[PDB]
Amino acid sequence: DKDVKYYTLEEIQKHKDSKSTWVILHHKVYDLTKFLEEHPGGEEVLREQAGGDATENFEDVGHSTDARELSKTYIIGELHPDDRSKIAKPSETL
């Protein structure tokens, strides 16, 4: 396989040490280690510190200049939907 692997929530929710920030947009995991050392402001600033309902329609260009393909080559895969916001049990009843 070489197209978006199903990572886990414990593997994404465990980047408190080391480097390479693992932010998430909606269902994709971003390893923006190249952006963390690009705009010295707070390492991970891809809308994921004070909440705010996801990152709106997308990333804002308020303090960005090269906003063209930063939310693509800075990704690694997706997150297992089983851990995302969906602990329901569709089907398996009728």
- Residues facing residue 75 across a β-bridge: 30
Residue 31: strand, helix, or coil: strand
Experimental method of this PDB entry: NMR
Residue 63 assigned ligand-binding role = yes
Domain boundaries 1-94, CATH class = alpha beta
Q: How many residues does the chain have?
A: 94
39 is in an annotated binding site: yes
Cα distances (Å, whole numbers) of residue 67 to 19, 41, 46: 22, 17, 12
- Which residues are registered as beta bridge partners of 13? none
Pair 23, 32: CB distance under 8 Å? yes
Question: Are the CB atoms for 74 and 35 separated by under 8 Å?
Answer: yes
